[PDB]
Amino acid sequence: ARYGATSTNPAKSASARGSYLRVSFKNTRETAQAINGWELTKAQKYLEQVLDHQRAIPFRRFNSSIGRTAQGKEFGVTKARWPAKSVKFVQGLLQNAAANAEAKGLDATKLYVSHIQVNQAPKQRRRTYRAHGRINKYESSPSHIELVVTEKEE
RNA sequence: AAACUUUCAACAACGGAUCUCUUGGUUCUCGCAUCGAUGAAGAACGCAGCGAAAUGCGAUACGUAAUGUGAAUUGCAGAAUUCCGUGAAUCAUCGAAUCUUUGAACGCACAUUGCGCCCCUUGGUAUUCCAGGGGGCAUGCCUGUUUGAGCGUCAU
Numbered sequence: 001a002r003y004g005a006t007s008t009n010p011a012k013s014a015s016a017r018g019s020y021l022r023v024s025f026k027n028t029r030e031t032a033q034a035i036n037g038w039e040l041t042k043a044q045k046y047l048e049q050v051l052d053h054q055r056a057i058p059f060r061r062f063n064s065s066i067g068r069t070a071q072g073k074e075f076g077v078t079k080a081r082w083p084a085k086s087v088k089f090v091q092g093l094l095q096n097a098a099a100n101a102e103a104k105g106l107d108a109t110k111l112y113v114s115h116i117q118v119n120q121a122p123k124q125r126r127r128t129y130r131a132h133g134r135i136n137k138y139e140s141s142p143s144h145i146e147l148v149v150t151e152k153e154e
Numbered sequence: 155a156a157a158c159u160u161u162c163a164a165c166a167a168c169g170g171a172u173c174u175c176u177u178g179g180u181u182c183u184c185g186c187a188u189c190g191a192u193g194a195a196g197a198a199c200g201c202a203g204c205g206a207a208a209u210g211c212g213a214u215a216c217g218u219a220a221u222g223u224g225a226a227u228u229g230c231a232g233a234a235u236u237c238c239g240u241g242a243a244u245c246a247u248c249g250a251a252u253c254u255u256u257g258a259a260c261g262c263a264c265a266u267u268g269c270g271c272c273c274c275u276u277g278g279u280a281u282u283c284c285a286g287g288g289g290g291c292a293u294g295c296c297u298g299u300u301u302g303a304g305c306g307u308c309a310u
Contacts, residue, residue, distance in 0.1 A: 004166040060157060076157070119167040144167065 003146050006115045013114065013150035014101030016093040025120050025143040026062035028086040032116045032145065034058060035090070039112050040098060040149060047087050047094075056080035057087075089145065097149045111149045119144040 001017060034057050035043040049055035056071035063079045072080040098108055121142035128138035 002166070005164065058157090063158095117166075122168070146166080 003148065004115060004117050006148055008114055008148065008150045012106065012153075013148055014097050014104055014106060014111075015149075016097035016100065016147045018089060018093050018145045020121055020142060021089055021145065022124070022140060022142050023086050023089055024083075025118060025141045027059075027081070027083040028089070028118045028143045028145065030059050030062060030081075031057055031083055031086040031090055032118050033060070035113055036116050037112065037114075039110075040094060040108065043113060044091065044094060047091050050082050050087055051084055053082055056082055090147075093145060093147050094149075097147055101149055101151075106151050110152045112152055113147065114150045115146075115148040117146055119146075 003015060003017075006013075035046070038046075046055055050057060054071070055074075056069060057080055058072055058075040058077045059066060059079050059081055060077060063077075066079055066081060068078045069080050072078050094113070097113075098111070101111060102108065121144050123139045124142060125137055125139040127135050130136055
């Protein structure tokens, strides 16, 4: 598998990937960018706080018309949300990546998530039926995710 | 200052253009004349050791016979020197057969798997009732035969 733009030594890094997932790309991108450059332990504590409805996720690009809150203040923004489905897939891949890093022989105490990205995936289509006997699409926004952890140095 | 917005590049994505290929098409030319009541074309249904199709076939059902070549089929299983043989094969050829219900469609009828009549035979105590099996029952027209009708008409 060929991953995105990664400036690290592959020997001190461990990778994970999830393709053709049925989460929303727009929320998953925010969920992923909220943990880029972080340590795995703090990220995994954060993503559970989210599900407990503390320490929200900031929405920065895909943020139109959503509501405001006060768990954005630790990031500066005033728009945030708590996307459980995206969080759960991301937690799964973090788990997988830590497993792979362990098996390659790296120390979990000082790993950080270096390169994380999501992509768009092929849509999945259904019909919805509007007034006056016409159809319109009702389709999902699936996502690929790819993720790299690596151990810190100077 | 970050986020955000925009521009470029790398990598990855959506998407499937371009390039190359092509058991297909189209056009031209040459040759041939070969459907059907001896039941056509078409249709329905069904058939394989495991197939829904396409292709093939018809209760002898991806086929039987005959002829030729001469050792395969193959997705799997199952058979196997039968392989110096009357002989493998989703082979080729094809002259013998089968060819369900249909259909011009032919006992009558059909939105029915409806209802009959005749002959021979078998069974049930059975020229008469029931069942099975086989074979028959259309119309128009022609030739001939057989039986007839008519003070139309001839002779005795």
